Ligand binder design. Structure first.
Ligand code: SAH
Ligand code: TTL
Length: 258
């Protein structure tokens, strides 16, 4: 798969998944509002706390950290591609042509409901993201040996990565074992991913995906040494079925390392 991700277009991917219709957060029944709600509700329990946190396979997105950022002071974002990391930095610095995550930032404020303004939220996130590093979940030591990243992390967040870089179940399983080592025993893992998806586009690139079920994700979290605190499913409605992929649903898992 690694070679397929070489033709990956960050802007095409962002437009396919974070721009209307999926990027229209006005409909409370959309996938965006759901993902944000899961993340928000989870961090609102105050069980996922700590000093450091790592985002595995950040890609060119930041929504996966909006609620998280206020509970951890050292945030590490990662990704296998220079192009993505470049895109991340473009938003982190507020340079020209960064992607606009304001609609997302705003809804995270809505959902959390602490009266915070979206600029302060975006400001906090940009402040707590200390670094954007390269990563390969396939290497049994994903980040490397002398990674500038604090290890082990207190928590982990990963959205649409593992199943999007694994040819089959076993690879998905090992990939989890790999990143799972980056997590402190007792730490927390927040995994978001596609259910029963087998491909999705990113411009000229056509990525292969491993179709997984909710049950298969659960058993994989256990086999990796986690206590599944929560695991819910979102069924992709017709209006959000657009051709950019064949995803059937989206899963959210809150897992704690034994
Ligand atoms: N071997 C590998 N290990 C880790 N990440 C990889 C990888 N191969 C590709 N990736 C990256 O995994 C990402 C999958 S797309 C997911 C993007 C983002 N997390 C979101 O929620 O939308 C891409 O950014 C891709 O570059
Ligand atoms: N990889 C894709 C899979 C389908 C999907 C659906 C809603 C939100 C994100 C995504 C992933 O980026």
């Amino acid at each position: 798969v690694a070679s397929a991700y070489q033709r990956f277009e960050p802007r095409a991917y962002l437009r396919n998944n974070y721009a209307p219709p999926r990027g229209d957060l006005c409909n409370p029944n959309g996938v965006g509002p759901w993902k944000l709600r899961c993340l928000a509700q989870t961090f609102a329990t105050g069980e996922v706390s700590g000093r450091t946190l790592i985002d595995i396979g950040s890609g060119p997105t930041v929504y996966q950290l909006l609620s998280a950022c206020s509970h951890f002071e050292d945030i590490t974002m990662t990704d296998f591609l220079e192009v993505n990391r470049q895109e991340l930095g473009r938003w982190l610095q507020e340079e020209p042509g960064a992607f606009n995550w304001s609609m997302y930032s705003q809804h995270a404020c809505l959902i959390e409901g602490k009266g915070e303004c979206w600029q302060d939220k975006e400001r906090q996130l940009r402040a707590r993201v200390k670094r954007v590093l390269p990563i390969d979940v396939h290497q049994p030591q994903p980040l490397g040996a002398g990674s500038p990243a604090p290890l082990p992390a207190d928590a982990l967040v990963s959205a649409f990565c593992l199943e999007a870089v694994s040819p089959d179940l076993a690879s998905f399983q090992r990939a989890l074992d790999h990143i799972t080592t980056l997590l402190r025993p007792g730490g927390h893992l927040l995994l978001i991913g596609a259910l029963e998806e087998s491909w999705y586009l990113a411009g000229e690139a056509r990525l292969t995906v491993v179709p997984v079920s909710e049950e298969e994700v659960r058993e994989a979290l256990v086999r990796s040494g986690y206590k599944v605190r929560d695991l819910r499913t979102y069924i992709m409605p017709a209006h959000l079925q657009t051709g950019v992929d064949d995803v059937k649903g989206v899963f959210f898992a809150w897992a704690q390392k034994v």
